[PDB]
Amino acid sequence: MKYIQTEQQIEVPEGVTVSIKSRIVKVVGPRGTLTKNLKHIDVTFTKVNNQLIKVAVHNGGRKHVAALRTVKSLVDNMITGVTKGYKYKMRYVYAHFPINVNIVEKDGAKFIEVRNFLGDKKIRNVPVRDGVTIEFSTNVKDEIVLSGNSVEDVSQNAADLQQICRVRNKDIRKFLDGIYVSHKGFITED
RNA sequence: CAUUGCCGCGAAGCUACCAUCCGCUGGAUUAUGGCUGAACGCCUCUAAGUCAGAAUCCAUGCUAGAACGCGGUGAUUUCU
Ligand SMILES: [Mg+2]
Ligand SMILES: [Mg+2]
Ligand SMILES: [Mg+2]
Ligand SMILES: [Mg+2]
Ligand SMILES: [Mg+2]
Ligand SMILES: [Mg+2]
Ligand SMILES: [Mg+2]
Ligand SMILES: [Mg+2]
Ligand SMILES: [Mg+2]
Ligand SMILES: [Mg+2]
Ligand SMILES: [Mg+2]
Q: One GO molecular function term?
């Protein structure tokens, strides 16, 4: 169809600075800073009144309009992640063998070590990505809390811990074992 | 002498899974499982982007070295 103009809104709240040269977006707030290279898209950003940035596609087909609301959602994720921050909570699910996860250092690389998953002698190792801060819940039994600015970094680190603890050669309908994400939320949320 | 006459042992050399030694580790991926995320206010591994991942692939390594591919360097003829 090639719609003439599709357009989206981005609400920049009171503490946030958004800076967009060519298609590289820099979002600065109370929690740090974030950068995305959006040069694969071809949208056009325009600043209206310092609390609002439009993003537009001119003469765009169905897939090109489709990526426009993606670009809105990604910058809003950056804005949320530098104002409220991002926080994931994972619980350990085990039947018989308890799962031992402690935050570990190997050559200054800050891994996550998982011993005794299903009684495996194999120690599993997940590296902590930068920005993600691993926490172990007090007054919740067997909960790991991943916190940081990027929802891309926090959720992929929470994805990597689930993916390393998969169950092999068993019926996974019964062998329900692993570390699963229980909550996707913010840090400064109430 | 017996077309190495025959028999036992027999060094050297060659040799035998009939004897010993030795046979490397990184990256990119497929299937698949994911993250973020629209389309399609929700949902979604996919559309943009991105993670992991096979005995696969491509390197590392190993063999040859273009006899018309290349480089460094040595010496370059007389009482002739
Ligand atoms: Mg599996
Ligand atoms: Mg079986
Ligand atoms: Mg005679
Ligand atoms: Mg004789
Ligand atoms: Mg052999
Ligand atoms: Mg999802
Ligand atoms: Mg895939
Ligand atoms: Mg894709
Ligand atoms: Mg990958
Ligand atoms: Mg190598
Ligand atoms: Mg040659």
A: rRNA binding
Separation of alpha carbons A73 and A41, rounded Å: 13
Q: Are A160 and A126 in contact (CB under 8 A)?
A: yes
Measured at the alpha carbon of residue A32, what is the angle toward residues A26 and A38, in degrees to the nearest 5? Answer: 25
Technique of determination? cryo-EM
Report the candidate in A105, A108, A126, A109 with the shortest Cα–Cα distance to residue A117. A126
Beta-carbon-side half-sphere exposure of residue A111 (alpha carbons within 13 Å): 12
Which stretch of DSSP H or E encloses residue A36? strand A32-37
CA distance A76 to A12: 8
Resolution in A: 3.0
Which tokens sit at A161?
A: 């811990």
Q: Which of residues 8-37 of A touch strand B (CB under 7 A)?
A: none
CA distance A117 to A104: 16
Strand B lies under 7 A from the Cβ of residue A77: yes
A44 touches strand B (CB under 7 A): no
